[PDB]
Structure formats: structure tokens, C-alpha cells
Amino acid sequence: LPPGWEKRTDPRGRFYYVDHNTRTTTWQRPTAEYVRNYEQWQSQRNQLQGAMQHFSQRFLYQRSFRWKYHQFRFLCHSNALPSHVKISVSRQTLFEDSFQQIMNMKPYDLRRRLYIIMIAREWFFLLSHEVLNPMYCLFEYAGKNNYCLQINPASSINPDHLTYFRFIGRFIAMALYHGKFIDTGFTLPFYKRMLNKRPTLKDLESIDPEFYNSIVWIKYFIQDMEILGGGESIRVTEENKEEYIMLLTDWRFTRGVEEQTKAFLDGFNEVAPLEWLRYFDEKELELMLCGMQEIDMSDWQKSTIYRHYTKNSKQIQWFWQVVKEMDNEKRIRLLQFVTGTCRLPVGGFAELIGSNGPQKFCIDKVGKETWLPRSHTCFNRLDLPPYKSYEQLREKLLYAIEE
């Protein structure tokens, strides 16, 4: 064990670890992996300072979603409660204080006019990041460099992880109720669950490109149903491929994280009934939580790369015309369809990241002219088929993204 750390024993007999050089505690043994991630994550907590000014520039509007969002904001401004709710925090204790104080209260009191003390937009922004602190063990990423947030299947290392997921639940819901934007980085598959929708095989590509490609070719227990080339070892045949893919796809989305997800929803619902989101889809829901940014086309255009196309190619030229005709909401919806998210990083389109590292936006000539445009989220890649009439593309583009 490295200098500064000790292995203490809580009065219930469980073992945790104290880092005396950073006055921190964690339930996890200090791997060289942990000191790596904690050191890195804290280096990113420092830069959070300046990025709050950029965050301020996120916005929503002052059946469509402009519609649906006013209907929602009304359902909240009506079920609201009188008075105020007071939270007090200090900068080295945003998480510890927030956590203990919000779980103390009955969930409805979180629907009063929240008064943070030490600033609300700062608080939701900061706390939305403080909960990814590796100290707590709740999350892991799926790609290099913080790309694809996921519940950590080994969260149980932290004996209290279900309570923490309930607090995040409560916290995400307060944001929706009181109308503030967060920055945690949940994926669309996670919003789909908040809406009782079933993640599909296409969604897997956002989360596990390699695993998705396996299911693409030729289409339980520690991964039941036997393949070569309930049932402890029932062979996968062409006369039961369909059910294998369906059972195994669901498995990849739920495995290891079923308790943690329930506790998240349980926490969300207490504060804002999950059925208040009946109207919304997964992309519209990420919009509310995250907020819209204004997409500027000149930035997008210099930073987009091409494959088999060129700046002056025929359909690549019609693509950007449909964009200029598009309004910012449709622009963001195009953004989500292709990158997986409505969140554009601080640098601009020049700095969007991907599964395997940095990855600018990419439009590729692929597919027959009878196809819709496809995307590959993990590569931020758009497949625009070689279309023949500009209005044909217009139809197929605006259809591919509105589904």
C-alpha cells in the first residue's frame, strides 16, 4: 500500500482505505489503476472552474418538443410546493453535504424553491460532476478518455452504493423539476430506461462496437445458450437465433447493474414521477437534462472530415444546405443521431471525442441510394448514401433523424 494510506476498519467490521495525503477515504483498495484515475479525475475537477462560464451558455426555450417542454414545465410549476428548501455546502464538501442533506429530507420538500447556501446553476453543474469521483466506485467508462458513461458492475465494492444511486436519482430529478442543466454524461440507452423503453441492438453500437459486431454477424447465464463456430447449455441453432440475439442484447444492457439502476429510478421517481415523461423520447429527455447549445454551421463545417466524399462532392453539398435550412433544435437532433449526444465540448466541433480517442465528425459515401443515412456513434460517423436528387436526401435525412 502506497505512502499516506492506511487500511482502517469500520465499526461494523468492513475494510475501507484512508488517503492521508489527500484527506480522502474510499472503500476501494488503492490499485495503481485507482491512483491513476483519481489523479486524472482530480486534474479534470480543476479545469471545471473555467468551463462553468461556457456551461452558462446552455439553454432551453424561454406534438412538438417546444410544445412538450412547456407542458412539462407547467406540470412542475403546478405540483410545486410552497416555501423554500435550504441546502448548505462548502467547496471541499459539495458532495458529502449535498448527499447527507438531500437523503435526510422527505422527497417532496425537494420540490420547494430550493435555496443552496455556501449558486444553484453552479451547484447542479459541480455536483453533477462530483458524483463521478472514482472515490465512490459508482461508474466506469466504455471508451478511452471518459467517453461512454456506464454504471460500474463492481459498484458493490462500495457497501452503500444503492443509497448513492438513490441520491443521484433524487438529484437528477431535482434538476428536471427545478429546471437546471447537468453534465454527468448519461447515454441515450440510460434515458431509454427512464422512459420504460427497451434498448435495441443498434443502441449497442454506441456502447460496445465490438460486441455489437459479433451479434451483427449471423443476425442465459455467464452467457448461456451454447454457440460453436432455462438451459445451462442449450445449443444456438438457426431455429432459435432470433431469441438468442434478443436475450443476449438485453443481457449486455442490464448485466451487473440491475440493482444500481433500480435504485436510481427509485430515487428519481420519489422526486418527480417518472410517468411525467410519457410524452418525451430519449433524445428529448437528454435535451432537458443537459440543455441546448446553439449549433453554429461554420464551426461544424471546417471540423467535419470525409470518406469517399469531398467538400465539393454533390451530396456533401446538399447535406450542408439541409443543415442551414434546419433550425438549431433539428441541428442538435442531427448532432445526437450521429454522435450519440446533444453535448458539444468546450472547444467546438474541432474537439469532439469518440470511442477510440479524438474523432472529428465524418460523412462517408456508403450504401445504396434506397437507404436511410446510418450512423456509427462510436466513430461519430455519418453514412450518407450516394443520393441522386437533393430533395430525396432532404426526405431521407429529415426522416432518419426524427425517428
- For residues 284 and 137, membership in a common domain is answered with yes
Looking at residue 373, the DSSP 8-state letter turns out to be P
- For residues 119 and 266, membership in a common domain is answered with yes
Asked whether the beta carbons of 178 and 114 are under 8 A apart, the reply is yes
Give the DSSP H or E segment for 392. Answer: helix 390-402
**Number of other residues whose CB lies within 10 A of the CB of residue 311:** 11
Pairing state of beta strands 84-88 and 24-26? Answer: unpaired
Q: What CATH number is given to the structural domain containing 377?
A: 3.30.2410.10
Grid cell digits, residue 73? 414545465
Question: Do the domain assignments include residue 375?
Answer: yes
Q: Considering only CA atoms, which of 116, 142, 119, 139 is closest in space to residue 129? A: 139
DSSP string for residues in 1-35: --TTEEEEE-TTS-EEEEETTTTEEESS---HHHH
Q: How far apart are CA 131 and CA 165, in angstroms?
A: 10
- For residues 261 and 250, membership in a common domain is answered with no
Q: How far apart are CA 60 and CA 52, in angstroms?
A: 17
Pairing state of beta strands 362-364 and 381-383? Answer: parallel
Question: Do the domain assignments include residue 389?
Answer: yes
Helix axes 32-56, 120-130, angle to 10 degrees: 160
Task: Give residue numbers after which the chain breaks (C–N above 2.5 Å).
Answer: 62, 118, 219, 229
Domain encompassing residue 238: 201-254
Question: Do the domain assignments include residue 327?
Answer: yes
Among positive and negative, which fits the CA dihedral 377, 340, 346, 91?
negative
- For residues 263 and 206, membership in a common domain is answered with no
Boundary (domain end) residue, out of 290, 314, 342: 290
- For residues 93 and 167, membership in a common domain is answered with yes
- For residues 248 and 263, membership in a common domain is answered with no
Question: Do the domain assignments include residue 265?
Answer: yes
Question: Do the domain assignments include residue 162?
Answer: yes
- For residues 359 and 212, membership in a common domain is answered with no
Residues 6+ apart with CB under 8 A from 378: 143, 148, 205, 206, 209, 340, 354, 355, 356
Asked whether the beta carbons of 263 and 166 are under 8 A apart, the reply is yes
Question: Do the domain assignments include residue 42?
Answer: no
Grid cell digits, residue 86? 435550504
- For residues 282 and 177, membership in a common domain is answered with yes
Question: Do the domain assignments include residue 44?
Answer: no
Data resolution in angstroms: 2.7
Mind telling me the catalytic residues?
378
Question: In the beta sheet, which residues pair with residue 6?
Answer: 18
Cα of first residue to Cα of last residue in the chain, in angstroms, is 53
- For residues 284 and 351, membership in a common domain is answered with no
Q: How far apart are CA 207 and CA 141, in angstroms?
A: 9
Residue 385 half-sphere exposure toward CB, CA atoms < 13 A: 18
- For residues 134 and 272, membership in a common domain is answered with yes
Q: What CATH number is given to the structural domain containing 179?
A: 3.90.1750.10
- Method in brief: X-ray
- For residues 70 and 129, membership in a common domain is answered with yes
How many domains does the chain fold into? 3
Boundary (domain end) residue, out of 243, 266, 290: 290
Q: Considering only CA atoms, which of 233, 232, 205, 249 is closest in space to residue 379? A: 205
DSSP H helical segments within 143-200, as ranges? 161-178, 188-194
Pairing state of beta strands 149-151 and 139-141? Answer: antiparallel
- Reading phi first (left if > 0) and then psi (alpha if -120 to 50, else beta), residue 256 is in left
Question: Do the domain assignments include residue 48?
Answer: no
DSSP string for residues in 214-247: HHHTT---SS-SB-----TTPBP-TTSHHHHHHH
- For residues 151 and 262, membership in a common domain is answered with yes
Asked whether the beta carbons of 248 and 199 are under 8 A apart, the reply is no
Separation in Å, CA 190 to CA 134, 145, 185, 262, 333: 20, 20, 10, 12, 17
